[PDB]
Hints:
Chain B: Belongs to the protein-tyrosine phosphatase family. Non-receptor class 4 subfamily. The complex is a heterodimer. Chain A contains no helices and five strands. Chain A is mainly β. Chain A has one domain: SH3 type barrels. By secondary structure, chain B is low in regular secondary structure. Chain B has no helices and no strands. Chain B is elongated and about 35 Å long.
Amino acid sequence: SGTECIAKYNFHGTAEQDLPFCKGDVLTIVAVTKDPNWYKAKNKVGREGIIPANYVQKRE
Amino acid sequence: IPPPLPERTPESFIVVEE
């Protein structure tokens, strides 16, 4: 509940902790990972997973 | 080949207490 990111591409799952999205999907940042571009956000479904920023855009 | 996402570090399991 803060920053919202939008998926540009349809990147599948790469890590058990990572969560796939569909271009146009919005995700909310919940926490940041050891890496920058790499950020952990949740879905509107209440799902929690990490997503590559290089695959999405942060409106914030 | 396009630019692949960032390296998948396991440290992700830890959240920095910014």
